[PDB]
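Researcher: Checking consistency across runs. Here is Bcl-2-like protein 1 again:
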Amino acid sequence: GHSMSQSNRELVVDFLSYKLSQKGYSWSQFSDVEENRTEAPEGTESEMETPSAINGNPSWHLADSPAVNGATGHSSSLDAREVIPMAAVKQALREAGDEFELRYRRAFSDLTSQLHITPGTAYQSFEQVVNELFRDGVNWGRIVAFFSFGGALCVESVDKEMQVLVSRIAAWMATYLNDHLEPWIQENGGWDTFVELYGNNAAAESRKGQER
C-alpha cells in the first residue's frame, strides 16, 4: 500500500528532477535511467580515437564557423513563468518551492551535521532527516520545503560522492516520504486536488477541525 497513482511521488520527484536537470541535464532526460555507467571510463586505447589523421583531413578549405560571439544560449532566453492549468504540477509546486529554495540559494543550516549524507545505503541517515522534519507532521509549508532540502542535498552529495547518489536519496526519500505522507497528503483533499490545486479542500481538511 504505497501511494496511489504516483501522485505524491511525482510532487517530490518533480522538484528533484527539476533542480537535477539544472545541475546535470541528464537525469531529467528519462527521469529513470537506472544506470550511471553508460559513459566510457578509462583511456588506455587512444589508437582508435585519433580522427583527422587517417582519412578525415585537417579540413582547411572553409572550416571556420564556430558561431561564438559571446553569450550563446547562456542567459538571453531565460523562461520560468509558464503556469499551465489542468495540472499545475511543474508550476504550482515548482514556483511555491522555488520561492523558498532559491530564496537562500542553498539554505545552509545545521541539518547537515545531523544528516551526515553518506554513499552507503543511508537507510538510518535518510530516515533520521525525515524523523526530525516530521516532529510537527507535514503541512503545505512543511511539504513544499521538504522538496527543497531533498533537491539541494542530492546536488551536494552527488558533487561530493557521485551522481549515483541522487538515485539513492530520491529512492529513500520518496519511499519514506510517501510512507507517512500517503495519508497526510490524501487528507489534503485528494492527490489530484492537491496537485491540480483546483480544490485543495475536499472535506478531510475542511469539515474535520473540531466539529467543523
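Researcher: Does this match what you'd expect to see?
Model: One thing to look at in this run: The chain has seven helices and no strands.
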